[PDB]
Amino acid sequence: KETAAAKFERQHMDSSTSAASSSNYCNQMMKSRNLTKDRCKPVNTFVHESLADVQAVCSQKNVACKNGQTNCYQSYSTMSITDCRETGSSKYPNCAYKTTQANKHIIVACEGNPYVPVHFDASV
């Protein structure tokens, strides 16, 4: 099936745009990446940097993950991100989102050989 690394790219990477494309960005992207198929995923973050720069985070600042595991890493620089958050009106199958752009440090969990991002933990 889909590898964990491929799943991270599908759920979290959008290098095509530099910021939140428009007020409709999250509605379009949550659907097109298949994040509304079985339910409305309540929150998700997209990162607008190159794949190379996000993979490099696995050699940056080691920090504890929210779940207590020790394989999380925080970026030294800020990155361009978009947060998608489920609105009040939203009801499956018609999921609806608010789009918010920010520049923040990202925290990701890394695994494997090669050692690559597999989950998005937080932004700070």
Swiss-Prot record:
E.C. numbers: 4.6.1.18
Active site: H12 (proton acceptor), H119 (proton donor)
Reactions performed catalytically: an [RNA] containing cytidine + H2O = an [RNA]-3'-cytidine-3'-phosphate + a 5'-hydroxy-ribonucleotide-3'-[RNA]; an [RNA] containing uridine + H2O = an [RNA]-3'-uridine-3'-phosphate + a 5'-hydroxy-ribonucleotide-3'-[RNA]
Molecular function, one GO term: lyase activity
Any one of the GO CC terms: extracellular region
Superkingdom to which the source organism belongs: Eukaryota
Keywords: Disulfide bond, Endonuclease, Glycation, Glycoprotein, Hydrolase, Lyase, Nuclease, Secreted, Signal
Keyword set includes Heme: no
A Gene Ontology BP annotation from the UniProt entry: defense response to Gram-positive bacterium
Primary localization: secreted
Positions bound to substrate: K7, R10, K41, P42, V43, N44, T45, K66, R85
Sites carrying sugar chains: K1, K7, N34, K37, K41
Entry function: Endonuclease that catalyzes the cleavage of RNA on the 3' side of pyrimidine nucleotides. Acts on single-stranded and double-stranded RNA.
Family: Belongs to the pancreatic ribonuclease family.
Known partners and oligomeric status: Interacts with and forms tight 1:1 complexes with RNH1. Dimerization of two such complexes may occur. Interaction with RNH1 inhibits this protein. Monomer.
Protein name from the UniProt record: Ribonuclease pancreatic
Record organism: Bos taurus
Source lineage: Eukaryota, Metazoa, Chordata, Craniata, Vertebrata
Part of the intact protein present: 27 to 150 of 150
